[PDB]
Symmetry: D3
Subunit: 239 residues, 6 copies
């Protein structure tokens, strides 16, 4: 038995750096820690949601899984900003796309995310609350990719509660308004950062084209991940 600072995290207060990368898959958090962090230690194991704290090029940085969907990321991110006093979270993830000019393996930097969730209406008296990335975070990601000579798409994501969509007309509307990424979490992250006066952003790589059916192979997903994670890590040095 270990003391629980939250119901979902065994990390002691202070065990997270002020900057955190989060991905849905805890096993990918372990890969990031093992391959890009120094001075690294595991700080959470509860529910298998592995989290780690170390340094990247000398600067404190943590990485942790967030699970799948808005309710899951909301738990972990609320706790990080509130209990662990985190200042900046960058979600690093994968996505689909419907946009005719976005392609599998593209890196997408998210400026804002729509959603079919109610969580943001509940925060703003039932109205439209845009889940919006912090501009300094977006800019740090854009500038890092430029320095690395990695092309990026910059624009809106759509965070759905329903991976297995049965919704006629959704993809056509997303394409009409040039949503570049379809995922399940960023729309929950950004308003929590707002609540705490903190910062958040998101960068994702396109695994699948929802319209054309193109799909990245395992090796292509690894290469896309290597590009995206390097962009995110370099961006943390400016944040």
């Amino acid at each position: 038995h270990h003391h629980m600072a939250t119901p979902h995290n065994s990390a002691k207060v202070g065990d997270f750096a002020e900057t955190v990368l989060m991905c849905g898959d805890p096993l990918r958090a372990k890969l990031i820690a093992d391959n890009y962090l120094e001075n690294a230690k595991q700080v959470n194991s509860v529910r298998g949601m592995l989290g780690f704290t170390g340094t990247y090029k000398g600067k404190p940085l943590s990485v942790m899984g967030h699970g799948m969907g808005i309710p899951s990321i909301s738990i972990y991110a609320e706790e990080l900003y509130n209990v662990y006093k985190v200042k900046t979270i960058i979600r690093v993830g994968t996505c689909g796309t419907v946009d005719p000019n976005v392609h599998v393996r593209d890196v997408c930097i998210v400026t804002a995310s729509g959603t079919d969730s109610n969580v943001n209406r509940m925060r703003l008296l039932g109205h439209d609350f845009p889940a919006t990335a912090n501009f300094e975070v977006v800019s740090a990601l854009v500038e890092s990719a430029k320095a690395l000579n990695i092309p990026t798409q910059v624009g809106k994501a759509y965070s759905t509660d329903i991976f297995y969509s049965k919704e006629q007309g959704l993809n056509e509307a997303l394409a009409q308004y040039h949503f570049i990424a379809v995922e399940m979490e960023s729309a929950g992250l950004f308003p929590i950062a707002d609540y705490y006066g903190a910062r958040a952003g998101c960068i994702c790589t396109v695994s699948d084209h929802i319209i054309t059916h193109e799909s990245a192979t395992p090796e292509e997903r690894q290469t896309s991940f290597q590009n995206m994670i390097k962009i995110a890590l370099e961006a943390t040095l400016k944040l």
Copy 2:
């Protein structure tokens, strides 16, 4: 590299029994498999969402984690009913309560679950779709608890997208209408079972009283879990 029957599950088709217990914590799925299943093998490890298949008293039974929140359980349960041809899922979990006559450590058998999610409105043209447990599953749980001489509360749950509620008046309304359990998943499970012509139910133990602040100790949670899991396992023999 192993073949992926779904993006979230490495189990081969046929590797799940027709009856599955699901809990949010994959580490608890491992505990259930290790302590109550025979002939057991691990069938999924993707994203750390451990799943296992074996037998309970000779009858095929699987157990797998579902993560936290409606979007997460919806992925895993949709795949189980669709790809893995599962017929019955019983969610085994923990919950809070606001009801003045429900107490920490009580076992709650869920007949239906409300929610603040939009996922069920999207299935029924925007209207009210009650997430309803299958009657044979509810009855099997009730009868199993009676045979084990374990008291149970039977009634409505509320599945929220937001663990860290800031919503004035919610607890008072839940208490006024005698919702017995507050959790985050059952309202997503029951309509998916309906879609596939299959069966689902839920049983949970009260970890915390949201109004009085009472909270079960670690040992009390283990004892509550032992009672609940025995009820669920015995119920599978009738399903």
Copy 3:
């Protein structure tokens, strides 16, 4: 002029038994009283909404009409639970079906009911509140039918505000999720029972198949009614 305990009911306080059967048609309430109750007297005549109190096999039991639609049943049931101190109401009625495996003359026992009404959103801060039958009532109906060797369908109803639907896609969605009964009242009854800490359920017979156009003849409806009413009356002895 007689004293009015409510605006809609001339019955004196105490004139209703603790258990009440309700049907939409007051003339059917009279038929039930005349043919199944002993010690019977008429206790309400206001607005022609006939109600009666007597005994069934020695146990106090009332029967009263509720009119058509959620607003009408809500008036009468609110008054019965509040002013008349009723503990259990079973709605006995007729319904349509869209389910491919439910047939005209089938008896349907309702576990929960969806709706296109707003009345339940208004009770739960705008969220999804499942109108859910009390489990002891459902079980009493199921067990009574078993003892009488009368087959039953057990599952969800849909209570609509609009008998003359013009809504494209509604029947297809109801069938997809295996709603077994289409009626106009149960979704209003169950939450009122919850408010008063009381019990409610519903049993109905299929008069019409909405998809195939099959329709029960007058004699077939009488036979279906005889089966359903015997199930309900026998269930009251266990409640």
Copy 4:
């Protein structure tokens, strides 16, 4: 057994006049027929919802009950306009008021009615559809009252699904915007008339002041009814 032109009305096609008065209480429909119609016959008895056809000052006129709430009036009025080819319906009823300048026993002529029902959103793609009385009907009622030297209030009603309101702030908002009548049916009637290219209106007498608690005695309600019904009957001669 008699032939049923609708499920809810035994009247033969042609048995209703082109102009119909409707009130919620079928016993009040009988009173109107017995005391104001000549050449009168009963044309419906189904569900006790008495309806009658005769003449008023030589002009064909019917009167029938509509029950309580939007779903109930919608059934009866849809059938009258569709199957029975009715051209004009005037609802004659009772109401409460919250307006500080409207008093018990006042006669209210309704120009439009708000509602907490969804039935009108479902007709207009989810938008705001005002349930609006036909201007010729409103004018006929206003002019008839003037000729009879009976004062009237003219303005908005609010048709609620919930007689037993628990809704904080509703009465204050209704008063702020000068809603003059609170009832349960007119918002369902007016859009059905629109659908059929037909005409509808409503006139009501104030039985109760919801804010001040004033309430009309039985004799006062009879006098108010006599004034209102004379206005409505005289208006039919101009319609």
Copy 5:
């Protein structure tokens, strides 16, 4: 620099008559003042939203532009009723029609207006609040047109936020329920008049048939305007 009684109006308190005509185009307000008012002076120039006060046949009358859309008219009308103590506003405007029996150049007198705006839900606890014209204003317009031997259509308008509609099925629904006018402002005006215990109405001429594509020429629009404005001006003498 001049003193600003509101942020949007340089008129001094008292500079508006108690009766005001409003049209969307400020240049049309100038035309009305120049051609129909005596004793006229310009009282507002802010944002180019020209307004004027004078007399029509000796009776004080003002005319001012309101801009396009509900938010714009709401600003100007709120200020007129609140700060300038106006008692009656008649909107004079142009509209489209979808109704099969309404034709280009027809004069439409509005009894109530639907909308796709949220502004009226926000006033009535989320419910349906009909934007309803004052009956004395409607009657004054109807009677004035009769005296001038100018035919009129009397009925519902629809005030949309979106001139360039992309909404499948909207026109068909508007036609089904006999909405006679499509415009962008009246649904915002009527509830503001209600709030202040004041009066409002609307009269419009059909510029375009949305279904048949017929369109009035410039000269035809001038003739339609001459008919409509004479009706409105004569109506002010009765208000």
Copy 6:
């Protein structure tokens, strides 16, 4: 009579530059043209909504008024992107603030805007569609202000339909989530730019603090405008 390329704009096709500044007040559009454009000509006068085309530092640039509210800007911007083939619109405006760390006279660069309008739900199947500024436009504004040594706040706006708010709790929620600007138009502009594959942004100066009641004097508003307009004009050179 002049030919009308749209119902609201007399400009000939080609008469607008590919880059346009828009402000609500047409008289302010004239001031911008008169004081910052060369080669300038007036291209629209319809409804007094003055628009002009010229050059800024040699680069083609137009400026036009947009009126007040989402419906008004939607008309003008839809036409500019569609008929006039405009590629970039920057809204230049004024706003209020509720944020405790934003002050009167501050320049706010908008990354996204929330709203109480329905126009964006209607574009995305009823879901949350974030009205999001184009990143290149935001960056051009940020970089221009940096080069001019003018401090800026960068973050979310809220576009309301209701200038005269009566909404309890709105300001507290806006402050809790650090909305920096309250205005009435940007949430309508950004999705129209998306539809056309074009670009939009917004920059505003704080005229009033809604919480503290501080208010900029006329001279202070002129100085704030001079700073903001110089930022916007310099940004057009990079777009």
